[PDB]
Amino acid sequence: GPLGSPAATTLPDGAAAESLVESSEVAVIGFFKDVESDSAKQFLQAAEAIDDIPFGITSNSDVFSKYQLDKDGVVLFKKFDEGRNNFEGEVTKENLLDFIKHNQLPLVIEFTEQTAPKIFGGEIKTHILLFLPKSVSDYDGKLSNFKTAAESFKGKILFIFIDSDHTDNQRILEFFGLKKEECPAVRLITLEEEMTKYKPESEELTAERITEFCHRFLEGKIKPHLMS
Numbered sequence: 001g002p003l004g005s006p007a008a009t010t011l012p013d014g015a016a017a018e019s020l021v022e023s024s025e026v027a028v029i030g031f032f033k034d035v036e037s038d039s040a041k042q043f044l045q046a047a048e049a050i051d052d053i054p055f056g057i058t059s060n061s062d063v064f065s066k067y068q069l070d071k072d073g074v075v076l077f078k079k080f081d082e083g084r085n086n087f088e089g090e091v092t093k094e095n096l097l098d099f100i101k102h103n104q105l106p107l108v109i110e111f112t113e114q115t116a117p118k119i120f121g122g123e124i125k126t127h128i129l130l131f132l133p134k135s136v137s138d139y140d141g142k143l144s145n146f147k148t149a150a151e152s153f154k155g156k157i158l159f160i161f162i163d164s165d166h167t168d169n170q171r172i173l174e175f176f177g178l179k180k181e182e183c184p185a186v187r188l189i190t191l192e193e194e195m196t197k198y199k200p201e202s203e204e205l206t207a208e209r210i211t212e213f214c215h216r217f218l219e220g221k222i223k224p225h226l227m228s
Contacts, residue, residue, distance in 0.1 A: 007048040009056040014066055020056050021077055028100055029056035030074030030087075031064065039091040043074070046093035046100075053104045081106045081147075098123070107150035110135075111162035111169075119160075126217070127158040128188040128198075128210055135163055145207045157214060188213045188224075198224035 009020040011029075021027050032040045035057065047055035053076075064070055076085040076099075085103050087096070102125075109115050111129070119127075132142070142161070150159050163169065166182070173182055186209050188198035204212060 007051060007055060008044055009054060011056060011058055011063075012060045013062060017056065017058070017063070020054060024054045026076075026078050026104055027054045027056060028074065028076035028085075028103075029058060031058050031069065031072045032074075033059050033072050035059070042093040043091055043096060046096050049093070050097055050100065053100055055100075076100065076103050078103070078106070102155075105158075107154060108146050108159045108161060111160065111165075111172075115160070122191065124191045125158065126156065126190050126192075127160055128186070128213060130159065130161045130210065131164070131185050131187065132161055133164045133184055135161070142206070149207055149211055153214060159210060186210060186213065188217070190217070196223060196225055201227075 009016075009027075011017040011020060017029065020029075030043055032043070034040070035044075040057075043055075043057075067075075073089075074087045074091075074096075076087075077083060078085075085099075087099065102122075105118065109118060132138075135142075146159055146161070162172075164182075165172070173179065186200040190196050190198065198213070200209070200213075203209070
C-alpha cells in the first residue's frame, strides 16, 4: 500500500530543502540539533495536527552556513512578503501552530470567495478592510504603501482589501446595507470578545486614513458600532 508519509520533511541539504518547498506554495522549516529532546517531538505532533502548511526540519551544518546561522531555530518560508520568519525561541506545539497559521498568509489579503473562509478563522484578531473600486493601476502603489504600514504593525493587525465587485459583491453590499451610494471607503474590523465592525467617516489620505484608524483604536478610543 503506497501511502503514508511524515508531515514534516527534513532536508540535510539545500537541494532537498527546495524540493519540499516546490511541493507546497508555503512551508516552514525548523532547525534542531537534538530532535531527541521533548521539544522536537512536540514540534512534530504540531506539524501533523495541521496539514495546512508542510513543515520541515534540518540539523546539518551545511544548512546553517547557507542561512548564515550557527544555532538551532525554526523559520517559515513564503512565496511573497518576508519569505522567512524565524521563530522567537520558545518551542511550543500550541504557540507554534498559531504562528504558522498566522504567518501562513500574507500581511494583506483581497476579499474573495476564498478569503471569506480564511477570515472567519484567524482566532480573535484585529484586521482592517479597505474598499477599492477597480484596484487596477494603483496595485503597485497601494501594495507598496500597504506593505510599509503592515510591516510597521506586523503581528498586531492585518490590512485587507476588497474589490468593488459591483457584480459578485452584490450580496456583500446587502450585508453592509449599502447601495447606489456604494463609493470608496475604509472599514475596520475587530475580534476578541465580540464581532464588531467599524465604519469610516472623515476623508484624509489613503495610508493616513488607515493608519489614522488603527491609532485611534490603540489610543483607547470608544467603540464604533454606530454614530452618536
